[PDB]
Amino acid sequence: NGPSSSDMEYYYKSLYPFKHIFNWLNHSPKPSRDMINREFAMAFRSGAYKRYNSFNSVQDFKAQIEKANPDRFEIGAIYNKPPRERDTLLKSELKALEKELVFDIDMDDYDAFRTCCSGAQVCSKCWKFISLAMKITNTALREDFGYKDFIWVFSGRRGAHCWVSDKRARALTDVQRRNVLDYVNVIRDRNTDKRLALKRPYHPHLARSLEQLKPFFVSIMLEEQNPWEDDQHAIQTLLPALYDKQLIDSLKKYWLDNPRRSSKEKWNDIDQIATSLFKGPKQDSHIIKLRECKEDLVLMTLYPKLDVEVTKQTIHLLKAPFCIHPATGNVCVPIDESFAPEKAPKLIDLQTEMEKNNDVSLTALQPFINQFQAYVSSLLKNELGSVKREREDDDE
């Protein structure tokens, strides 16, 4: 049951930060191609879906959204002509030039490895998977790519979205976004059935990420989530990560014979049984292989699971920050690694608060708006300072 058309209309009229979002996407206060040629899509309570909208100014943006009153809207690429002029129409036609580099983490992708919620439900406990996803992704963004202007935003329900605004990130072609994705998407076939068998020696990014995540593995996976106490799930998602049929078969039998041993007990069984099985002349080679499999398992469970096509496609549409999620009533607020999903402002609560306080500015959403304004101001400085660096290079 979604919030009413009138609650949504009044949210747009009163609280949605149209100016700051416009400026964020335009990269300047003065309307440019970066907004005038940018696609927005709108989704309606009815299932209708309208692509190829575009807005000229803060007031045009606000007006069209107010008038349409969609449940959500999605931001797209910056094109060579205005998307709303599609239909009339075909230059060659409509060509994508640039767009923010985005990353999307959906918690249901971790459902094999969490037990506290499944599907489109989340809580503070399993949100830790998102926080780790941020830590890892942020590390690659800053350290390896040297991107500096990025923000994470709550999706309203299932996870978080990362928006990279750095000029050179926006400039990426479809191939280059696939190469960025490939670099950060260490884990392949989101198993099971099989073993990741990641390459070795580990590439430096994997090595780093492993070292970042390992300290969390026992607490999150073995203790909090404990997905492998359920034997069928251990057989389905723990054992296929191992390298040896005999070891697999032995563990399987042992857990069939002694059911419901905890994830911590099972993690230890792997070692004990492999030790008895492989003591020999080649025991050193099995010691190494098993370790590699367990490291890979740390990655398989805790390393960010990205919604890959979201990142790979320059034209891809993604929900705008500060939209309301109609299913949850949540506002899609900017976030960091301290975020609880229980902590997202709810639209109904904000509307009560603003009437109680008889002032639009006196809601729990204001601090998120203020922080976003501050972020945007910094971005605008950097965009301008970049053309200032072009001048400083040209100063010769």
UniProtKB/Swiss-Prot annotation:
UniProt cross-references to InterPro entries, sorted A to Z: DNA_primase_S (IPR002755), DNA_primase_ssu_euk/arc (IPR014052)
Reported effect, residue 309 to K: Cold-sensitive
Active-site residue numbers: 39, 104, 106
GO cellular-component term (any): nuclear replication fork
Gene3D superfamilies reported for this sequence: DNA primase, PRIM domain
GO BP annotation list: DNA replication; DNA replication initiation; DNA replication, synthesis of primer
Enzyme class: transferase
Sequence motif Zinc knuckle motif, location on chain: 116-126
Keyword line: ATP-binding, DNA replication, DNA-directed RNA polymerase, Metal-binding, Nucleotide-binding, Nucleotidyltransferase, Primosome, Transcription, Transferase, Zinc
Superkingdom to which the source organism belongs: Eukaryota
Enzyme Commission numbers on file: 2.7.7.-
Transmembrane segments: none
MF terms (GO), sorted A to Z: ATP binding; DNA-directed RNA polymerase activity; metal ion binding
Function: DNA primase is the polymerase that synthesizes small RNA primers for the Okazaki fragments made during discontinuous DNA replication. In a complex with DNA polymerase alpha (DNA polymerase alpha:primase) constitutes a replicative polymerase. Both primase components participate in formation of the active center, but the ATP-binding site is exclusively located on p48.
Stated family: Belongs to the eukaryotic-type primase small subunit family.
Quaternary data: DNA polymerase alpha:primase is a four subunit enzyme complex, which is assembled throughout the cell cycle, and consists of the two DNA polymerase subunits A POL1 and B POL12, and the DNA primase large PRI2 and small PRI1 subunits.
More about this protein: The bound zinc ion is not a cofactor. It is bound to a zinc knuckle motif that may be involved in sequence recognition and the binding of ssDNA. Present with 197 molecules/cell in log phase SD medium.
Protein name: DNA primase small subunit
